[PDB]
Structures are given as C-alpha cells and as structure tokens.
Amino acid sequence: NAAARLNDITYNRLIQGLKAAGVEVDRKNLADIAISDPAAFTALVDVARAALPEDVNAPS
Amino acid sequence: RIGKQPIPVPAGVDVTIEGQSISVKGPKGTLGLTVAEPIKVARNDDGAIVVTRPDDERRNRSLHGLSRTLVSNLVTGVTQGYTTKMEIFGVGYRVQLKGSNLEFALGYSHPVVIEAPEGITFAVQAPTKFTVSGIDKQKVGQIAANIRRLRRPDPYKGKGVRYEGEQIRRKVGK
C-alpha cells in the first residue's frame, strides 16, 4: 500500500489489475520487491494499470 | 420584490467596487459595507445600484433582499441623515446638555449621564424633548434604544422615556 501510493495507485486497484492481467505473485514477494527492487515494482504497477478497465465505477 | 429594484444616486462621489466592496460620500461623511459573496453589485446606466443573485435557493433569496436595504441605508444617511425624536414624560423629569453629553433627571438619587459615541450628535429642543442625530441607521437606533431603557416601564403613571408618537400600554392600579 505504501509502495503503490508513490506510483499514484491504490492497493485497491493494484490487486484488481494484477488479477486482471494474470500475475500470480503472492503478497510476500510483492512486498519484498517493494523494498529490494523499487524499479521493478513500478513495471508491475504499469501492468496493473493497463489491464484495469476503462471506467472502474461502470457496471460490469 | 425587494432587491429587484434600482437605488438612485443623488451625489455619491465615490461609488467604488474593489472585490465586493462599496462606499458612499456626499454632504456627510463616508461609510463602508461588505456584501456576502453570492450577491453581486454593479452600476446601472443611470449610476443606479442593482444587486443580483444565482436564483432559487433559500439562502440566496434571504440575502438578496437583505443586502439591498443596507446599501440603500448607506446612500440615504450620507445624503439625508437620521434623526430620532424622543420625549421625556413625567413630572420633574427633564434633560440637559453638558458639552457633547446629555444628563438626565429620571427620579434617581444621582444624575444619569450618556456619553455620546464617535458619530452621534445630541441636541435638545425643549426641557422635556430632544433628538438623537447621526448618519448610520443601525448606529443611531442603538443609542436611542439605550436611552429608552433608562427607566423600567411604568404603566401606572406613564413616567419614563418614550419615542415620539408611540403609545405605551397602561393599567389602572388603585
């Protein structure tokens, strides 16, 4: 949640976009890339932002 | 009805608007007033004052008729000032000046003095009649109401201080 809000996304829409893109990384290793490799965490936030739907409040 | 109406300017030599502000000057001194921000003010073709509003709210309709009868009470008192004529009733009750002040004899054991504030000018016309004069309508009626309450109301003998033309209530007593 802290490493997502520096890449201006919430934890709410990060787990949604990773599931919509098919990235099955567990929360242990996703909170260890957040410290030990902050530049590859951003490359995951940019995938969870593209697979997220165009209007997240629109009915599905 | 009030507020959808223009306010004339006889002289009004400094009718200015600087960020929702207003002033007025003429045969008397100057005044100042600040209008609440949903109400705007401008000048008409004749130099007249017209105020507007974003329509149909409870909070905007109340301030619209409010902020017309304050601007019209600025341009009145600068041109034609305000006087309140007051009468002293009761035997042995009178009024004098001592310089700019005004001393009363209202049946007490001490004289009662009224220090006139910065803008209120006193003038007696008789030993039991006087007038309170000034330019701001809210500031004149505040000082006149301080003189009205100088005695507890006595509806048995009618003694006290009154406005002219008003009729107090009366009881019969013994």
């Binding site: 802290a2 809000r5 996304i9 829409r13 242990k28 410290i35 | -």
Partner: protein
Amino acid sequence: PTYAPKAGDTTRSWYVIDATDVVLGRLAVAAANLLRGKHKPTFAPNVDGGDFVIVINADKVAISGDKLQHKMVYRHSGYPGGLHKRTIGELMQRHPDRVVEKAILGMLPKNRLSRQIQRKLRVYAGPEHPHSAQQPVPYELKQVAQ
C-alpha cells in the same frame, strides 16, 4: 525472511505543512501518517521510521464556526470537582498550537513508541518557523484518485 530494518537504516527528512485553509482533521491525519512513516515501504510497526513535520500557521486552521462555540476540551486535576473545561474558541485565542497538537496526538497509537514519535512534531502559530537551518520541503495534501 521478510524485511526488518536494522538500526542505522531509517533515513529522515523535514516537511513543512502550511495550514491556511485546511480543516483540523485532514491536517492531523496527514501529519500523523507522516510522523510514523506509513508512506514509506520500509514500514515496521515497532520501528520509529518517519519524518519531521513542521506545522506553520496554526491559527488559520479551518474550524466550523459552530464548533468554536460548542466543542469543549476537558481536563481534570485529580482533586474533587477539578474537571476544568474550555472551548476551542477560547483556546485558539491563547494557544492555537495546542489545538493542532492535541488533534494529532489522539491519532497516534497509545503505546510507548508514540511518546518517541511525538517528539518529532513542531507546531507554530505564526507563519515563521525557526528551523530554517534544515531544508524543509513543503508538503501539499494529496489524494490518490481511484
């Protein structure tokens, strides 16, 4: 093993928050998150990470006009009938740096280490702060859209 911060790894910084048209409860939350280091991905709840917060213009914080009349601050002295009370409106005249401070301290966890975290807060009433020897970067209140 998950990350645990060693001693000598918590870097710190200085933030100044202008309080000119900000409500008392937004500005307390954003200061208390910033004192504790919630915004840093090396957060651990037993380690005092987090930064130094300066709050200038405490006398211009936005309080609703019906709270200054009615919201009360209660204190008790231990003596019988020693419940003394003030209002917010009669603390903002005397001590406007205590109103912004008391709102922050109730939002910190009620433990030993928050007595060490609250030493990193300076609250000032005027627009001038004496800590210009450091370089406090200004901090505007964000909201991440969603």
